[PDB]
């Protein structure tokens, strides 16, 4: 069939037969037919339900925090254009003029008969709605916007956005929790508007009104000329726009200095004047004060990408001049800072988040690595050694099978060495199994070369218990010969060399070896002997650029410690040398099992020419020409320190030890909360920080195959092979993609622990602007709802994809956000290097809009001030906005009365009337002055409509409703045609629940062009402040209005476009908002790596 | 606790059942005529003995 | 309300849980094992004061 082409102007119920005017009539009917203890879950199932709101403060998505490699490697979007003109406020018509009932020849005009869009809004009512981007044509809008309806809408659902949906149904507004509704919409009213100012075109105005000043070239959309500019009105008649339009200045209009640089090229900024507000403005300007901030000029930025590649990649830049060339990528060192703990708050602290993270770098640290592992050569050492084949046992053979993993099994090495650079999360622990037990002796030929294998690749895992692992496991596999002290009782000599995990149980004779008698222990001192003298020096280098920054925390900043000391890398051809502390480090371990081979033990039991054998086997190892005593020393440490750089997340260091007691790291600790907001200053740290506990089981076989068996290529040249491996991996933008991250990152906590802080009281130091607001649910769950909508909201400005600000609320309170770093040492040193947030910049932005919010209240719907319930039986002129006589009876004047906490009438016998109890608990007559709190009202709404509701219909009484803020409701009337209020006024009484109340309905009439008669009416509802900011002009299209007020277009809005005292770049902007300002639009070229700098 | 959670309302809504029921009322009764049968039986025991 | 989520999302990220963890942590994962008469043993405890 055909499509319909109107709606129905009666619906039906089908369950009665019932016709319905209106849908909205429908869908309460239809949802009072559903409705015992079922049919009110069903019923509120249909009250408290809607999705259609971007932010979803409800939905609590439990442990949604998890780090990806791809969820950083999104980054977001900053530069979003505004090719349109940036205010936020259009000047809505309410009541069109057709509307007015009498209707003569002459007295209204309209621009609309002249073929032509008027500038200004032509009707009974102009009110200046809080509509943002309405004339935003730039392109990919924010997501998130805030589009408030007119005051004679409902305006409430702008005002649900948290701590509202299943406490209060849809007609109401929370008033309790309505400095949070609030706050969030003006963070909903920012980063709807964090836009950059392009300039469109400017053509000359050729045409005779304003004959050839240079307008903004609206030239698809005409309809946005006419409004852009109301300098540029015609003016045929005395319309009251007309009156106002008529004091414009004529050179107030399109650009005034175009700042350009090169001809040719495009202008770097123009400067004109347009429409806008002055509050969206310096939304803009500190947008681009922001996106200048990790901004740097392309000098520089080659300086930061060689020395992030440390300086063996070919970047070249020309030297000439660029004009518009905003790369923005580069947060500070402290943003980092604030990333990095955030990264290491959304992940689990166990070993399910490094271990990601140490193959992201083994991955590509095996890609660019000229190491070529190939265990032939070891192989080819061992078995030209000498054996006569007549023996049982055959030291040769007993080996390589200890030796020989079945697959590859060589990156387990390269995940030991990545982890490196992750030591505070993850400590590689030597494997448990590959441990000789305690029960072979050192006459058992396998369980020895077991200890050879853990003491060659003891300084390559790094845990901190690993060097007293290595020896203990030849002080278990002699016990019998040489016995010495192991520490505290229940740990005895022959306990397996696993459990001295801890550092209580390190041996006082691996302390001090002079504790172990030569006379008693001679081959278990030299054990201790050799391990404090020939365990590496924990070195370090630097990484990244000064410039850039990094994310080192416990590390100063672009450094990183090493378990080796390093040397820089050469460029020349390399060969395998002796000289590292590689060498140093395995040449003395087989210097001292050549001893325990040759010693006295041994000797008595081992048969004299395999023990030659065994000597043979290990003299042969020494002297294996292998190239990682090189690597390690001089390669590794390059790639080490560029490879920290590319990879998506920087290296978490914490320093390594060599052997210190009182310096091992027990653990490595961040916490999501300071232990100042809670009572934890003084306790142990470990009670006050979440801890990483990470391992991995590093084989020990696999790590001497790669230690002692590396080759490269002959020829190599290692800046070269660096400088051609890491080409691929720097011509790209995407390694600054973090620092994108980072102050996003940053942005969003420092504007959330504001937003949670703003909702308590007196929380952290914030200033608290909207602190007159009325806010009394200050609970956690309250508070985790506002900081997962500021977070739900910072993912759909920037649309993003990552996990910041999730895992601030996994311990659940997050009114208490704070980032906190620290590790123990087993000497007690509880360094807590922890990170405040940066200088930031949105945060000054929102600050700003709620200062001006409180000037402005009623521009977006809210009403200050109380609230007055009098009989006023008038006929003239009715303003309860704007009051023009005194505001009656203040609380505490002469013989007004407050109620108390109840709301409670008594009633009286015998004709006597019913009397209240006032606040001092004493029962007073109701006929007088009456203030009523507004919670008070909402538990007592049936005794008030009972009571002394009708009371104030007769007029023998007035009632004040005290209340901070509120939503108001207009309702306008012809006052030709009669009204009572009280109709309009108990439909307000009917819906306030003790939960939240509706907004406020105050009659208005609508302004007439005639002096027509006017019907003598009773109004009830009107305030005390005046609250009619939101009025733009009375009557427009009118010649001059009658009976209402005259309420023209107030020049205090407008200084930039009648007054002749206007400075170019001046506002009121804590004060009221101006609404043609200068401004300035920019033409910023977008440049990749590739626009800034060529890279072979 | 609950996510809109105000003490003076949740108690007021919670309380309000409570004190509908007669047992602060039943509480008295059922001691004023213990007590009666208390004295009746005490003296009941004394004086056969 | 009593509702351990808000513990349980805080404890199984630290935990572990394998094969060759389960005898440290199995205590307290007959904390965190659900089956329970809405804690019962809480409010017969406060009831008991
Ligand atoms: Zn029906």
Not at 457 to 468: E, F, I, K, N, W
Not at 539 to 565: D, K
Not at 712 to 734: C, D, M, R, V
Request: overall charge negative; charged content about 15%.
């Amino acid at each position: 069939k055909v499509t319909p082409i109107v709606n129905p102007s009666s619906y039906v119920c089908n369950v009665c037969n019932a016709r319905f005017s209106t849908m909205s009539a429908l869908s309460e009917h239809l949802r009072s037919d559903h409705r015992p203890m079922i049919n009110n879950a069903i019923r509120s199932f249909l009250t408290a339900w809607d999705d259609i709101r971007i932010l979803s403060p409800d939905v609590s998505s439990k442990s949604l925090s998890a780090y990806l490699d791809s969820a950083v490697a999104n980054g977001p979007e900053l530069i979003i254009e505004d090719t349109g003109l940036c205010t936020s406020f259009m000047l809505l018509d309410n009541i069109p003029s057709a509307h007015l009932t009498k209707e003569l020849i002459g007295f209204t005009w309209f621009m609309q008969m002249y073929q032509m869009t008027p500038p200004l809004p032509e009707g009974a009512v102009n009110r200046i709605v809080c509509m943002t981007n309405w004339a935003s044509l730039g392109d990919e809008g924010r997501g998130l916007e805030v589009r408030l309806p007119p005051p004679t809408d409902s305006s409430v659902h702008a005002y649900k956005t948290v701590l509202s949906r299943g406490y209060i149904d849809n007609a109401q507004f929370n008033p309790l929790a309505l400095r949070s509704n609030v706050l969030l919409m003006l963070l909903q009213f920012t980063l709807s508007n964090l836009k950059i100012n392009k300039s469109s075109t400017f053509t000359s105005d050729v045409t005779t009104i304003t004959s050839g000043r240079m307008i903004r070239a609206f030239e698809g959309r005409p309809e946005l000329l006419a409004l852009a500019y109301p300098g540029r009105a015609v003016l045929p008649t005395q319309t009251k726009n007309a009156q106002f339009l008529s004091t414009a200045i004529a050179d107030r209009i399109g650009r005034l200095d175009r700042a350009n640089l090169i001809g040719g090229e495009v202008s770097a900024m123009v400067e004109c004047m347009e429409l806008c507000d002055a509050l969206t403005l310096h939304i803009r300007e500190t947008y681009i004060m922001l996106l200048r901030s990790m901004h740097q000029d392309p000098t520089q930025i080659v300086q930061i990408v060689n020395e992030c590649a440390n300086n063996l990649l070919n970047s070249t830049i020309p030297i000439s001049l660029r004009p518009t060339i905003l790369c923005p990528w580069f947060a500070s060192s402290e943003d980092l800072r604030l990333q990095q703990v955030m990264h290491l708050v959304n992940i689990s602290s166990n070993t399910a988040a490094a271990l990601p993270l140490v193959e992201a770098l083994s991955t590509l640290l095996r890609s660019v690595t000229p190491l070529v592992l190939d265990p032939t050569v070891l192989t080819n050492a061992i078995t030209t050694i000498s054996e006569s084949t007549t023996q049982t046992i055959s030291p040769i053979s007993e080996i390589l099978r200890l030796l020989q993993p079945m697959g590859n099994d060589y990156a387990a090495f390269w995940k030991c060495i990545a982890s490196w650079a992750y030591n505070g999360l993850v400590t590689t622990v030597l494997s448990e199994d590959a441990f000789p037990d305690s029960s072979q002796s050192i006459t058992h030929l396998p369980s020895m070369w077991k200890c050879l294998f853990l003491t060659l690749a003891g300084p390559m895992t790094s845990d901190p218990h690993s060097p007293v692992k290595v020896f203990m496991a030849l002080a278990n596999l002699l016990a019998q010969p040489e016995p010495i002290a192991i520490g505290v009782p229940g740990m005895h000599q022959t306990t397996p060399a696993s459990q001295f995990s801890h550092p209580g149980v390190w041996p006082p004779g691996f302390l001090n070896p002079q504790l172990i008698n030569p006379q008693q222990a001679p081959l278990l001192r030299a054990f201790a002997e050799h391990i404090r003298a020939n365990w590496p020096q924990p070195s370090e280098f630097g990484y990244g650029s000064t410039l850039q920054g990094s994310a080192n925390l416990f590390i100063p900043s672009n450094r990183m410690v090493y378990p080796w000391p390093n040397q820089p890398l050469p460029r020349l051809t390399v060969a395998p040398t002796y000289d590292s502390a590689m060498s140093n480090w395995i040449s003395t371990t087989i210097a001292f099992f050549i001893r325990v081979v040759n010693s006295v033990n041994m000797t008595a039991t081992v048969n004299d020419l395999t023990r030659r054998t065994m000597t043979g086997v290990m003299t042969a190892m020494r002297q294996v020409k292998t190239m990682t005593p090189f690597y390690i020393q001089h390669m590794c440490p390059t790639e080490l320190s560029v490879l920290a750089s590319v990879t998506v997340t920087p290296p978490f260091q914490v320093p390594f030890t060599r052997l210190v007691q009182n310096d091992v790291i027990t653990n490595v600790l961040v916490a999501r909360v300071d232990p100042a907001q809670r009572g934890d200053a003084a306790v142990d740290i470990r009670a006050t920080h979440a801890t990483f506990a990470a391992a991995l089981p590093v084989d020990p076989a696999a790590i001497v195959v790669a230690m002692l068996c590396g080759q490269t290529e002959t020829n190599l040249i290692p800046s070269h092979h660096y400088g051609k491996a890491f080409a691929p991996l720097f011509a790209s933008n995407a390694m600054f993609t973090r620092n994108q991250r980072a102050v996003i990152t940053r942005e969003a906590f420092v504007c959330a622990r504001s937003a949670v802080a703003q909702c308590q009281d007196a929380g952290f130091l914030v200033p608290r602007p909207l602190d007159a607001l009325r806010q009394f649910d200050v609970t956690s769950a309250a508070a985790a709802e506002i900081m997962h909508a500021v977070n739900d909201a910072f993912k759909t400005a920037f649309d993003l994809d990552g996990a910041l600000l999730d895992g601030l609320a996994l311990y659940g309170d997050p009114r208490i956000a704070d980032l906190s770093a620290a590790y123990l040492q087993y000497g007690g040193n509880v360094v807590r290097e922890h990170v405040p947030p940066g200088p930031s910049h949105i945060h000054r932005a929102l600050q700003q809009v709620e200062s001006t919010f409180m000037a402005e209240m009623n521009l977006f719907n809210v009403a200050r001030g109380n609230l007055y319930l009098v009989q006023t039986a008038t006929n003239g002129n009715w303003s309860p906005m704007a009051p023009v006589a005194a505001p009656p009876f203040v609380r505490g004047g002469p013989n007004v009365r407050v109620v108390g906490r109840f709301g409670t009438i008594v009633p009286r016998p015998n004709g006597l009337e019913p009397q209240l109890i006032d606040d001092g608990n004493v029962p007073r007559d109701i006929a007088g002055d009456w203030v009523y709190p507004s919670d008070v009202l909402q538990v007592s709404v049936a005794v008030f409509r009972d009571y002394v509701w009708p009371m104030v219909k007769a007029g023998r009484t007035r009632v004040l409703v005290e209340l901070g803020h509120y939503v108001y409701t207009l309702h306008y009337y012809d006052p030709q045609i009669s009204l009572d209020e009280a109709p309009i006024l108990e439909e307000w009484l009917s819906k306030i629940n003790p939960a939240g109340i509706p907004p406020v309905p105050f009659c208005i009439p609508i302004p007439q062009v005639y002096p027509c008669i006017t019907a003598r009416r009773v109004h009830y509802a009107f305030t005390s402040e005046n609250n009619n900011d939101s009025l733009f002009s009375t009557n427009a299209a009118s010649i001059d209005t009658a009976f209402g007020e005259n309420a023209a277009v107030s020049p205090l809005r407008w200084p930039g476009l009648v007054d002749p005292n206007y400075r170019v770049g001046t506002n009121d902007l804590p004060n009221r908002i101006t609404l043609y300002n200068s401004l300035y639009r920019y033409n910023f070229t977008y440049p990749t790596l590739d626009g800034i700098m060529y890279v072979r």
